Amino acid sequence: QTLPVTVYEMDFLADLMDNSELIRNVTLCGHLHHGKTCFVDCLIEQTHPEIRKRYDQDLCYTDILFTEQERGVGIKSTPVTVVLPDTKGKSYLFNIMDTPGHVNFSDEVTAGLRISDGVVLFIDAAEGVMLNTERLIKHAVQERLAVTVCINKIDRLILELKLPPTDAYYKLRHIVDEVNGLISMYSTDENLILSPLLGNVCFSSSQYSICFTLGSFAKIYADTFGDINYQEFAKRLWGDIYFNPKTRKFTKKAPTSSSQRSFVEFILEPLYKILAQVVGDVDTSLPRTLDELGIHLTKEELKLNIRPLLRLVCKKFFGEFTGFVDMCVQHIPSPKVGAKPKIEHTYTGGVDSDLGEAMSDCDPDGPLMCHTTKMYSTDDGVQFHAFGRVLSGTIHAGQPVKVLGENYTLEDEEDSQICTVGRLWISVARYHIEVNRVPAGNWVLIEGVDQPIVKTATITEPRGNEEAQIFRPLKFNTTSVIKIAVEPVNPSELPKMLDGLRKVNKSYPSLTTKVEESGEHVILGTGELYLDCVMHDLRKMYSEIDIKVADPVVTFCETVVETSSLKCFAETPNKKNKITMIAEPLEKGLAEDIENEVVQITWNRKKLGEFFQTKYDWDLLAARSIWAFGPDATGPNILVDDTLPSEVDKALLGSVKDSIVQGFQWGTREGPLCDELIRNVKFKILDAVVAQEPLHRGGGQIIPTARRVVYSAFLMATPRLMEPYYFVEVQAPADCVSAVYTVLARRRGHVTQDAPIPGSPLYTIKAFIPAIDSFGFETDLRTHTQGQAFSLSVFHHWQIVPGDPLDKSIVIRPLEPQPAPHLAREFMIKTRRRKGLSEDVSISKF
Amino acid sequence: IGVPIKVLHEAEGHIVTCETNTGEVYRGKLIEAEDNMNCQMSNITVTYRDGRVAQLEQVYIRGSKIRFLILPDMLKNAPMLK
Amino acid sequence: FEPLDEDWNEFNDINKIIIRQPIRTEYKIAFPYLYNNLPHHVHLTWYHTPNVVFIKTEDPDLPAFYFDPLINPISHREPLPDDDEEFELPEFVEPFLKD
Amino acid sequence: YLTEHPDPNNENIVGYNNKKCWPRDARMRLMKHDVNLGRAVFWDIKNRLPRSVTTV
Ligand SMILES: Nc1nc2c(ncn2[C@@H]2O[C@H](COP(=O)(O)OP(=O)(O)OP(=O)(O)O)[C@@H](O)[C@H]2O)c(=O)[nH]1
Ligand SMILES: [Mg+2]
């Protein structure tokens, strides 16, 4: 096969995969536009002699789609596999996943954190900590990965702000302190202190190829002057420690008043002087500086423009990126060491199983266990390639394997298939290297299994491994709430669109496409640019037809506020057994504790009740009476028992509860108002008259009956609607802040925080907005503030829509923005009309 | 520093076997190696001069007493040797 | 520019559409595939560039690296080893480019 | 009508003769029930005439 020229032999990369101690699985992440893909470009140019950046444009080696080239943002997380040397000279295998930093593509990061062991967070030195950085610290800690932070774009402290050296040091220290605070807020482990003293924080400028920790710059001193222990000298170039030039020692007190810190004196001021002598004094004193630092340039190399000459001088000075390799080796575990928390967190059945102890050793021979999370398209768009990691065993080209879906259990055995692998590749961004086998510990790109795979899959052996269970599905960071509806223009081309509607379902992890009862094809999404890319990929790649799209709306939910006025009783049509229920709302903050798994089912009734009686102050009769919660396995609704044992025999009532929970599950999704999920309710059984014969206790009589019980209890207790609220952070100059207050005033929002950025003239505005008002919001700010303000929106919470959704006295004139009391009625009626229900629902319907 | 010391630092993490001036052959995974030939090794099968096979789990060999080392065979594609 | 007749349907029913904010032309131009039917010859616009925070120099007598009061102030406030374990540099070792 | 002529893709909207001289809210609104009723009416009238004698 043909391959570009590489500084290492490909047989060395083939033989280096067999040792799982020299492999690192790293995910690069961060906020939007902080320097991820350019750092990957610098690594690719480090490994390849023939790939060079243009003098006017960026390279973007790992942005291979045309949408990423026209938009200028990252859309798809792309892997690359390289071999890099460290400071000591030892070669290491890196599997690097470049993930996008935009918030609406946060699902592209969660698919990247499942198949990796360490996180490298890029932070802009000028802007600092932002929204998606704060969300990704939480999401990377809760997924139990190691965390390192690299501070990119330090030259914006030099060439844009023109900032004094100790003030730039204070800016960097403030960024590191805010990162340590965001680590310590969500972690219970105290051994996660990030500091450059520990080799844990790197400094970089992606535009001019600058990358250093303390140890690499100490190695530069050791290569320049000699006879200096660089591992000891790098331990004192940070913090309040001073060099005393008389004693030639490092003391913690000031020799003079003009004494600078050691980081300013030995590291940061030579960086200022290099950049200043390249930019300002190229004509007079640059050859004196380049003769002093030991750098020789050709006469044609001196005649370049300022930015490529600065890139060339910093590349000749700093050289290879050894500090990043030192950080990723020292503080990110190998897959042989870090396999145990990965199997403990991601494998169903626990690490204490028989197969879990076999997978915890990273054994390259034995049972084949692979977990594929990502699906990549070809050039033609007719077939997909799966992408995942090999947890155990060794996968072979041509080996018949078994593909396990996300609905597979040992009891069912329905969601499974036997397939044949065509080829195996290891992935670089713009080319692929074909191999015949991949051992355990690496990443793998599998051809020929793409037919049963929807979101993720588990690749196992056909014979043996009969106790194999699937891994957990992806737990996404946010909730997709935007509804759009699609139709084809020519109605005879409906089987074509249903092709593409299941093809973009594979390449997008958080995408949800469904078919309503009225025949509408509804696609869920997270934002405007997300569904823009959905439409581009859909049409131009998988449909080649014309598709009509409707106006976007958001997903509503249903709730109660007051206690029900009357006890809701209902019988089965067998007229033997009766169930009576009171519906009440939950307390503030309990639903959010159920959703974040602070409270859980399958606990052995003790700690569960102690939570309710400790924090929210439930009684012992109330804490010891939960039957189940949620329509989904952790949903925010509770089925509660208030049936006294003096009136209802609890030994016979515990037999029908297995059907009453199926009833409550099937009826807390698709509620009675507009067929949506119920929020923040406890459904409390007070009276139950249970049948005596077992044939009258069947589920076919009682499950629609318990459905009608839940519906009657919900409709009596003053039902309301709930809409999602987005959290919005706006980066803007100090003059357009009043214009931001002006624009947010007309979309029913409110500003919660207005804070200046330390070390920057730009301000941050943090606010909450309704999601249905957020259409064109970014365009309104970027038009009204002359393009200076910029905004991002994530899903934050749910609140009650103002108005009565059952007030039939309200008349609604069409095509007019209604005021505040008419909103719940308008939303409820128009969603019923859109989904295909009746014009109204009555109180005595159920 | 020359080439064979860089080849020694490359063989860390793999299985090497060393013979020293006391005629004893130590086989196992090399953990650490310096500029001088001080070799920290682990999971060691030990062959004496008479022929007894022993199991020693942490060995630190001084580089002065070393006769020679025997390296893996896939280091012929290492970058410093090409 | 000069240009380069739709019946009612189940799809474009205005009793289903919630009119909250009026959709403008620049919404259809910024995101040309979400709000447009038949997008034949559109081009994807450039999304965003980070805000250049460069401050112009108005006084030639000031130093080039000066804490301009246009910049917001930084609100001021670690395992450091002890002084007694004395690490001494050699005599000819200096910081880079001190001349 | 739908017993002999099934419509799985809802294709009976395309091919519907409509009067373009009126405004959009003034002419016939093409809801699916009314279009199916119109197709059924024209089918029931067309069945009563032998195609060798006359043709609609
Ligand atoms: N001043 C300066 N600009 C930089 C530096 N690194 C990157 N940039 C610029 O910032 C812009 C965005 O860089 P990217 O690397 O595309 O940003 P990104 O992090 O890939 O954005 P995502 O697509 O979210 O991953 C480009 O114009 C880069 O040239 C740096 O060190 N200094
Ligand atoms: Mg990028």
Curated annotation (Swiss-Prot), chain A:
Subcellular location, record wording: Nucleus
CDD domains to which the protein is assigned, alphabetical: eEF2_C_snRNP, EF2_II_snRNP, EF2_IV_snRNP, snRNP_III, Snu114p
Any one Gene Ontology molecular-function term assigned to this protein's record: GTP binding
Binding site for GTP: 30-37, 98-102, 152-155
Keyword Ubl conjugation annotated: yes
Domain of life: Eukaryota
Key words, A-Z: Acetylation, Disease variant, GTP-binding, Intellectual disability, Isopeptide bond, mRNA processing, mRNA splicing, Nucleotide-binding, Nucleus, Phosphoprotein, Spliceosome, Ubl conjugation
PROSITE patterns, sorted: G_TR_2
Keyword Nucleotide-binding: yes
Pfam family, one: EFTUD2
GO CC aspect terms: Cajal body; catalytic step 2 spliceosome; cytosol; intracellular membrane-bounded organelle; membrane; nuclear speck; nucleoplasm; nucleus
Domain tr-type G: 21-303
GO biological process: cellular response to xenobiotic stimulus; mRNA splicing, via spliceosome; response to cocaine
Subunit structure: Component of the U5 snRNP and the U4/U6-U5 tri-snRNP complex, a building block of the spliceosome. The U4/U6-U5 tri-snRNP complex is composed of the U4, U6 and U5 snRNAs and at least PRPF3, PRPF4, PRPF6, PRPF8, PRPF31, SNRNP200, TXNL4A, SNRNP40, DDX23, CD2BP2, PPIH, SNU13, EFTUD2, SART1 and USP39. Component of the pre-catalytic, catalytic and post-catalytic spliceosome complexes. Component of the minor spliceosome, which splices U12-type introns. Within this complex, interacts with CRIPT. Interacts with ERBB4 and PRPF8. Interacts with PIH1D1.
Family: Belongs to the TRAFAC class translation factor GTPase superfamily. Classic translation factor GTPase family. EF-G/EF-2 subfamily.
Described function: Required for pre-mRNA splicing as component of the spliceosome, including pre-catalytic, catalytic and post-catalytic spliceosomal complexes. Component of the U5 snRNP and the U4/U6-U5 tri-snRNP complex, a building block of the spliceosome. As a component of the minor spliceosome, involved in the splicing of U12-type introns in pre-mRNAs.
Name the UniProt record assigns to this protein: 116 kDa U5 small nuclear ribonucleoprotein component
Gene: EFTUD2
UniProtKB/Swiss-Prot annotation, chain B:
Name of the protein in its database record: Small nuclear ribonucleoprotein Sm D3
Physiological role: Plays a role in pre-mRNA splicing as a core component of the spliceosomal U1, U2, U4 and U5 small nuclear ribonucleoproteins (snRNPs), the building blocks of the spliceosome. Component of both the pre-catalytic spliceosome B complex and activated spliceosome C complexes. As a component of the minor spliceosome, involved in the splicing of U12-type introns in pre-mRNAs. As part of the U7 snRNP it is involved in histone pre-mRNA 3'-end processing.
Signal peptide: none
Shown part of the complete sequence: 3 to 84 of 126
Taxonomic superkingdom: Eukaryota
Family affiliation: Belongs to the snRNP core protein family.
Keyword Membrane: no
Subunit structure and binding partners: Core component of the spliceosomal U1, U2, U4 and U5 small nuclear ribonucleoproteins (snRNPs), the building blocks of the spliceosome. Most spliceosomal snRNPs contain a common set of Sm proteins, SNRPB, SNRPD1, SNRPD2, SNRPD3, SNRPE, SNRPF and SNRPG that assemble in a heptameric protein ring on the Sm site of the small nuclear RNA to form the core snRNP. Component of the U1 snRNP. The U1 snRNP is composed of the U1 snRNA and the 7 core Sm proteins SNRPB, SNRPD1, SNRPD2, SNRPD3, SNRPE, SNRPF and SNRPG, and at least three U1 snRNP-specific proteins SNRNP70/U1-70K, SNRPA/U1-A and SNRPC/U1-C.
Localization annotation: Cytoplasm, Cytosol; Nucleus
Keyword Lyase tagged: no
GO cellular component: catalytic step 2 spliceosome; commitment complex; cytosol; methylosome; nuclear body; nucleoplasm; nucleus; pICln-Sm protein complex
Keyword annotations: Acetylation, Cytoplasm, Methylation, mRNA processing, mRNA splicing, Nucleus, Repeat, Ribonucleoprotein, RNA-binding, Spliceosome
Extra remark beyond the main annotation: In the autoimmune disease systemic lupus erythematosus, antinuclear antibodies are developed with Sm specificity.
Curated annotation (Swiss-Prot), chain C:
S-S bridge residues: none
Tissue expression notes: Widely expressed.
Cellular location(s): Nucleus; Nucleus speckle
Entry superkingdom: Eukaryota
Function: Plays a role in pre-mRNA splicing as core component of precatalytic, catalytic and postcatalytic spliceosomal complexes, both of the predominant U2-type spliceosome and the minor U12-type spliceosome. Functions as a scaffold that mediates the ordered assembly of spliceosomal proteins and snRNAs. Required for the assembly of the U4/U6-U5 tri-snRNP complex, a building block of the spliceosome. Functions as a scaffold that positions spliceosomal U2, U5 and U6 snRNAs at splice sites on pre-mRNA substrates, so that splicing can occur. Interacts with both the 5' and the 3' splice site.
UniProt note: domains: The MPN (JAB/Mov34) domain mediates interaction with TSSC4 and SNRNP200. Has structural similarity with deubiquitinating enzymes, but lacks the residues that would bind the catalytic metal ion.
Associated disease: Retinitis pigmentosa 13: A retinal dystrophy belonging to the group of pigmentary retinopathies. Retinitis pigmentosa is characterized by retinal pigment deposits visible on fundus examination and primary loss of rod photoreceptor cells followed by secondary loss of cone photoreceptors. Patients typically have night vision blindness and loss of midperipheral visual field. As their condition progresses, they lose their far peripheral visual field and eventually central vision as well.
Protein's name according to its UniProt entry: Pre-mRNA-processing-splicing factor 8
Residues of the full protein shown: 279 to 390 of 2335
